[PDB]
Write a protein that binds this ligand. Structure first.
Ligand code: ZN
Ligand code: ZN
Ligand code: ZN
Ligand code: ZN
Ligand code: ZN
Lengths: 265, 109, 263, 185, 329
């Protein structure tokens, strides 16, 4: 069965981003599209599930030279007294049947938390203690001692934008959408490329797919710089270099892990 | 759980008894001591069986000649099964307390 | 209204080192500047209230729960009480060589529970916007990181702003602390002119802080390190019990003793 | 009487609402149907559906069955249980008791009703201290004679404040009592 | 007692008709959502590494209102949107638990998978028997702790006790607050629970190097404008607006040191302070914690520092600060 074709038809226009990126991977003819998907009323329904007799009657009386309004009409249509009680008992039983369809912790080193990841003679204490004890025999010098006009102005000037302690562009708009779309494409493909990269996966069938994905990295990064070139030759302003870091770091991881694999071999 | 009933000391398997159980046991012991037929009512569906059985067993031990045996009747067999379960639990508790088997027989027809 | 709390780090070791150095700045002038700041804070409005805490290596003590010189009786009482209590605390103090680092965080906890008590007692009609103007004066202790982080998170939940005013040293822990709760961080390099910094950067309350130009926040280095040799690490291997940042993959982390199963 | 009430509720919209609110099961004279209905009722009490079991006080099911925790939580009594006043067997049984042992006919009739009601309403307190409420939807029970003949344990709990609650007031107090019963000792 | 610091929790809300009944002072559904907003925010504030997910079940169908995420604001917005939900239909425990199981099956073993079903309508119409699903839940070690409303449901009682969770029924709104606040805290790890090391990454906030030289412009990663500076990743190298967040590429959790430090108080619970009403030779009128006179005949003391704390001081210390001020010294 063409289940893949049916799914592609379903998602062809319902979701714009998914199909946009999947098509983009083919617009420049990067790779085959197989890997793309390889890696990744109420009343009548209630009656249908309630009355098996109604189900059989519907199957035998499927609309044939009749009308659904007439079928609806057929629904509602001491001997009668006991029939009502029996009907409730049977109906509740049918509803119920339809619903019943088949370590104490111990530690040896706690001061490590007291000094967590945050990083980092005797007569001196005596001298400082006595000196500070004798320091404050006089108090309330606020009248002049606390502040002076010259020092006050210098702080003002420092607080000024050009002073110390106080250091002090949305021109492009349409380029924003293009950058977002490119970032989404990079994320989409990096997801599969990094899906099993961190795990060692020392198996033949597991490593085959990482090798294929690593080649796909070359093949996609082949086309990325061409769009980069198109965008660059406009104004030579507002450089977009963050995208380069992702590609270069992915390449560095690829090559370093290749060298590590060769060393392990 | 050994209860120092006014008449005698009576064993009891569960940990605690409500005051209504004390009243039930004392009234029942009064009736047995009088050796006269009587009637009494207790609310709980369960618990009355264990209290009654324990008191009857203790009275039998104290005055075996006074009472030859107990004939405990229930409405239905499914119900009397629960009674025999209660009696089995009580006998196991008493046997553990005594440390050995005693000449006591209990059965349902 | 606003409830201000000044947590002064009056470390005798460091301030007496300054006294021995005979530098221009002194603990007396620092206390006077803090006093002036509190007086101005209450001067702002009647409903506003303040409190003061002093830190020492041993413990931390509150410095605050006519018009001889023609002065607001209330501010006169504040001056007298703070002066007397600070002199008493500095004059009387035991000596313990083993413990010399200043216990700044322990006071913070006292400040937080004091603010909670005041918030409970105050009438529900008026809303109180409390603040803690921490004034550090000495290097922090490594062993206090955990408790200080606890109190910082409690302050974040309770909506109190920790405005740090470190001087003579940049405490990474304290800057991290104020960054979490959004309090301002000012490092005054001119100690003699410290009070001008208070009457501008710190004195304005959270109500007007947004609608005012103040020095930009300093970048915070949220570093992580393994528990072995104490060094920056970008990737940490924590477990589900210790929640400890470690060096490298190990059969079992020492602080856990758990029976980790390989895979 | 049960059939007549059920038929009236069916003609009105109350019954459809009752079925939507909680599954409904009814008792019949035939023992096989009674057993099947009760078997499904137990599962309903266990499963999320819940259940409203309509039965007759004289029905063998009422005497045989025992209701425990999460079974028959709220026992509803619709009308004082009285036997039909035409069955001639009871006429001999009753007039003979009047002639000998000197029991009034009304006295014995009310005794036969109260004993039966206590039998059919006393199940919810089976054991293990399992909460539950017994609601009697009849002003006759409010009469002093019925209360006096009621068993002591139920009557002493019963109070004048809740003796003759309106339907809505009874519902509210039942909700509050269930709240209090909910939560641990 | 071993505790699972990292837990993926699903708060299953039922959009049943019974939620329409206004048993509580406001509408039942509105009250539950309003309080569940607070529950979500507090849960994130008390377990940053953990993440939450909401499944709304109505009309016999369960829909994922919000997938697993580390951002409380997104879930809060989802709650506010759901406040206006129609609230018509019948819930399906099988459907809701199956959706939760499908999402949680691929979750890492080390993390604790948990479900909190806020059950309102006692009925449970499901396509398949739930007793069978109970076996799969036990096999998958997914803790399920139901909170019933106005009903002691038997199937949910057996669900909770068999799967290891706890069952409760709302006595009132105040007790509902207490129940959810209790469920906020991490549950103790049982014998079935297992612990394993989890890879973690610690990013550093970065800005323009020097006067916007060799800048690193970028918009966001899950209408984001250009950002001069922000957080980054050791491996993704993709700008992240806020932390903590799971990597969109690596699959590794990015989280800073304070977020981890926020959970140490769970490992270090504070021992309850004995309450002595009498003064007991406590001549200090001022409470040490708050330096205020003790206006009530109550005092609290530790077993180490032996300090004095009033009612408010002790309550606050054991509730929020989670550490004794004086006893820190
Ligand atoms: Zn290391
Ligand atoms: Zn560990
Ligand atoms: Zn990453
Ligand atoms: Zn206090
Ligand atoms: Zn203490």
């Amino acid at each position: 069965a063409n289940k893949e074709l049916e799914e592609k038809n379903r998602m062809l226009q319902e979701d714009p981003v998914l199909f946009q990126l999947y098509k983009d991977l083919v617009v420049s003819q990067v790779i085959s599209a197989e890997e793309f998907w390889a890696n990744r009323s109420d009343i009548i329904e209630s009656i249908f599930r309630t009355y098996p007799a109604v189900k059989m009657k519907y199957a035998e009386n499927v609309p044939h030279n009749m009308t659904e309004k007439e079928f609806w009409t057929r629904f509602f249509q001491e001997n009668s007294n006991a029939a009502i009680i029996k009907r409730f008992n049977h109906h509740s039983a049918m509803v119920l049947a339809a619903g019943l369809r088949k370590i104490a912790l111990n530690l040896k080193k706690s001061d490590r938390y007291y000094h967590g990841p945050t990083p980092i003679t005797s007569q001196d204490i005596i001298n400082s203690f006595q000196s500070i004890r004798q320091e404050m025999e006089a108090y309330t010098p606020k009248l002049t001692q606390v502040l002076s006009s010259s020092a006050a102005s210098s702080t003002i000037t420092a607080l000024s934008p050009g002073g110390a302690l106080m250091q002090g562009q949305m021109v492009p708009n349409d380029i924003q959408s293009e950058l977002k779309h490119l970032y989404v494409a990079v994320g989409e493909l990096l997801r599969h490329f990094w899906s099993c990269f961190p795990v060692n996966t020392p198996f033949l069938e597991e490593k085959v797919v990482k090798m294929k994905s690593n080649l796909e990295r070359f093949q996609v990064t082949k086309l990325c710089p061409f769009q980069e070139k198109i965008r660059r030759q406009y104004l030579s302003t507002n450089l977009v270099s963050h995208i380069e870091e992702m590609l270069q770091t992915a390449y560095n991881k690829l090559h370093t892990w290749q060298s590590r694999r060769l060393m392990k071999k | 759980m050994k209860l120092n009933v006014d008449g005698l000391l009576v064993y009891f398997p569960y940990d605690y008894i409500y005051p209504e159980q004390f009243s039930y046991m004392r009234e029942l012991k009064r009736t047995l001591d009088a050796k006269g037929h009587g009637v009494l009512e207790m609310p709980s569906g369960t618990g009355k069986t264990v209290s009654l059985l324990a008191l009857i067993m203790a009275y039998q031990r104290a005055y075996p000649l006074e009472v030859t045996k107990l004939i405990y009747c229930s409405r239905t067999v499914p119900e009397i099964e629960k009674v025999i379960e209660e009696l089995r639990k009580l006998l196991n508790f008493y046997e553990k307390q005594e440390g050995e088997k005693l000449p006591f027989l209990g059965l349902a027809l | 209204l606003n409830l201000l709390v000044i947590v002064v780090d009056a470390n005798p070791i460091w301030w007496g080192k300054q006294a021995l150095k005979e530098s221009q700045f002194t603990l007396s002038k620092c206390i006077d500047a803090v006093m002036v700041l509190g007086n101005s804070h209450l001067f702002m409005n009647r409903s506003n209230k303040l409190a003061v805490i002093a830190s020492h290596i041993q413990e931390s003590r509150f410095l605050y729960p006519g018009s001889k010189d023609g002065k607001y009786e209330l501010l006169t009482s504040a001056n007298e009480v703070i002066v007397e209590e600070i002199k008493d605390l500095m004059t009387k103090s035991d000596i313990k060589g083993q413990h010399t680092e200043t216990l700044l965080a322990g006071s913070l906890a006292k400040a937080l529970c004091y603010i909670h008590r005041m918030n409970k007692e105050v009438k529900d009609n008026q809303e109180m916007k409390s603040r803690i103007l921490v004034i550090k004066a000495a290097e922090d202790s490594a062993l206090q990181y955990m408790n200080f982080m606890n109190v910082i998170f409690a302050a974040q939940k309770q909506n109190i702003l920790i405005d740090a005013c470190v001087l003579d040293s940049d405490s990474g822990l304290l800057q991290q602390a104020c960054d979490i709760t959004g309090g301002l961080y000012l490092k005054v390099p001119q100690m003699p002119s410290l009070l001008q910094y208070l009457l501008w950067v710190f004195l304005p309350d959270q109500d007007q802080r947004s609608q005012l130009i103040l020095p930009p926040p300093v970048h915070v280095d949220y570093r992580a390190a393994c528990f072995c040799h104490r060094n920056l690490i970008e990737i940490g291997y924590v477990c589900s019990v210790c929640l400890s940042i470690f060096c490298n993959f190990s059969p079992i982390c020492t602080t856990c003793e758990t029976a980790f199963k390989i895979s | 009487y049960m059939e007549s009430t059920v038929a009236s509720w069916y003609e009105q919209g109350i019954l459809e609402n009752i079925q939507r609110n909680k599954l409904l099961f009814i008792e019949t004279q035939d023992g096989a149907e009674t057993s099947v209905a009760l078997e499904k009722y137990q599962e309903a009490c266990e499963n999320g559906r819940g259940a409203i079991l309509l039965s007759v006080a004289r029905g063998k099911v009422s005497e045989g069955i025992d209701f425990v925790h999460h079974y028959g939580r709220a026992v509803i009594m619709f009308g004082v249980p009285y036997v039909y006043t035409q069955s001639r067997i009871l006429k001999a049984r009753l007039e003979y008791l009047r002639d000998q042992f000197q029991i009034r006919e009304n006295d014995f009739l009310t005794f036969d009703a109260m004993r039966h009601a206590a039998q059919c309403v006393g199940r919810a307190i089976r054991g293990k201290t399992d909460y539950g409420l017994m609601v009697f939807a009849d002003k006759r029970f409010a009469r002093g004679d019925k209360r006096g003949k009621l068993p002591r344990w139920i009557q002493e709990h019963l109070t004048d404040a809740n003796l003759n609650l309106t339907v809505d007031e009874g519902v509210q107090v039942a909700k509050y009592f269930l709240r209090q019963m909910a939560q641990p000792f | 007692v071993r505790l699972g610091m990292m837990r993926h929790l699903y708060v299953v809300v039922d959009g049943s008709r019974t939620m329409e009944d206004q048993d509580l002072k406001p509408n039942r559904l509105t009250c539950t959502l309003k309080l569940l907003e607070y529950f979500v925010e507090e849960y994130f504030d008390q377990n940053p590494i953990s993440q939450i997910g909401i499944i709304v079940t109505k009309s016999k169908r369960a829909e994922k209102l919000t997938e697993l995420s580390g951002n409380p604001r997104k879930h809060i917005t989802s709650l506010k949107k759901a406040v206006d939900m129609t609230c018509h239909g019948e819930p399906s425990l099988y459907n809701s638990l199956s959706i939760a199981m499908q999402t949680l099956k691929h979750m890492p073993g080390h993390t604790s998978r948990e479900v909190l079903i806020i059950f309102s309508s006692l009925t449970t119409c499901d396509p398949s028997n739930i007793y069978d699903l109970i076996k799969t839940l036990k096999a998958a070690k997914i803790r399920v702790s139901v909170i019933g409303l106005s009903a002691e449901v038997r199937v949910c009682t057996v669900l909770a006790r068999e799967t290891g969770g706890t069952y409760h029924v709302i006595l009132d709104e105040s007790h509902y607050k207490e129940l959810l606040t209790h469920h906020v805290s991490p549950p103790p790890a049982s014998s079935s629970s297992e612990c394993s090391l989890i890879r973690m990454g610690f990013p550093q906030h970065t800005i323009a190097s020097l006067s916007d030289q060799d800048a690193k412009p970028s918009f966001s990663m899950a209408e984001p404008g250009l950002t001069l500076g922000g957080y980054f990743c050791p491996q993704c190298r993709a700008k992240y607006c806020e932390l903590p967040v799971e990597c969109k590429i690596c699959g590794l959790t990015l989280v800073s040191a304070p977020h981890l430090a926020r959970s140490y108080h769970h490992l270090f619970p504070l021992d309850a302070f004995q309450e002595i009403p009498l003064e007991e030779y406590n001549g200090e009128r001022f409470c040490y914690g708050c330096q205020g006179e003790l206006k009530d005949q109550h005092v609290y003391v530790c077993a180490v520092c032996q300090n004095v704390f009033c009612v408010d001081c002790d309550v606050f210390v054991h509730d929020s600060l989670h550490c004794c001020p004086g006893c820190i010294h």
